[PDB]
């Protein structure tokens, strides 16, 4: 079946949730986002657990590498020409969402130009 062959040999989807998503690794240092997010869910009784698009290591970085010399991408919530800014739900497996954004905004500006 063409669909089951396509699901295996191409990276699981991140613009759609129809094919779930790599979100494991076996060290205890690479599950950091889940613990940090947990710590907050235990610590603040008012916490919104942000909904987040799972990556799937080094595929957000090739799409920043696309941007940097080519066309716009829709996993980046950019607006107009002078504002190229970062989508508000992208995370990498082993970094805090706040921490990760902080870098995506550096290289956002170097693709802004």
């Amino acid at each position: 079946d063409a669909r089951s062959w396509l699901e295996q040999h191409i990276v699981h989807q991140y613009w759609t949730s129809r094919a779930p998503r790599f979100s494991h690794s076996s060290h205890l240092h690479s599950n950091l986002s889940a613990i940090w997010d947990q710590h907050l869910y235990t610590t603040d009784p008012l916490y919104t657990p942000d909904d987040k698009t799972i990556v799937t290591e080094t595929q957000v970085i090739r799409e920043t590498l696309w941007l940097l010399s080519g066309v716009k991408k829709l996993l980046i919530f950019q607006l107009n020409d002078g504002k190229v800014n970062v989508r508000n739900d992208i995370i990498v497996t082993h970094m805090t969402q706040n921490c990760l954004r902080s870098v995506l905004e550096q290289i956002a500006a170097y693709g802004q130009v």
Partner: protein
């Protein structure tokens, strides 16, 4: 109809070819209850609902475009099934402001 309704159950969930059984039987039951609609046909009336809706969500430009697209649509081929198609797109219409709460935290309840 069975092969078509089924394939919809597999695609929407994006996974499962018998793990979507529950959803199929359910779709079949729902379709098996007889709805009657508020207005059946007239191209102009459904087209108008879509125009007013456009204005209402602040996507005025797009509303302007939709009219070009509507006329275009007839010329690539004439539809007998349009009211129903144009309705389906209507009921799935959304506003560009706000989110619908969380529905990825709602599963845990």
């Amino acid at each position: 109809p069975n092969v078509l309704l089924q394939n919809l159950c597999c695609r929407i969930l994006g996974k499962g070819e018998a793990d979507v059984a529950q959803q199929f039987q359910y779709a079949v039951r729902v379709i098996g209850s007889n709805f009657a609609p508020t207005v059946e046909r007239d191209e102009f009336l459904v087209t108008e609902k879509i125009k007013k809706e456009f204005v209402r969500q602040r996507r005025e430009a797009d509303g302007a475009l939709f009219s070009e697209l509507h006329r275009k649509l007839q010329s690539q081929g004439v539809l007998k099934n349009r009211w129903s198609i144009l309705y389906l797109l209507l009921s799935l219409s959304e506003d560009p402001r706000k989110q619908p709460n969380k529905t990825s935290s709602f599963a845990a309840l």
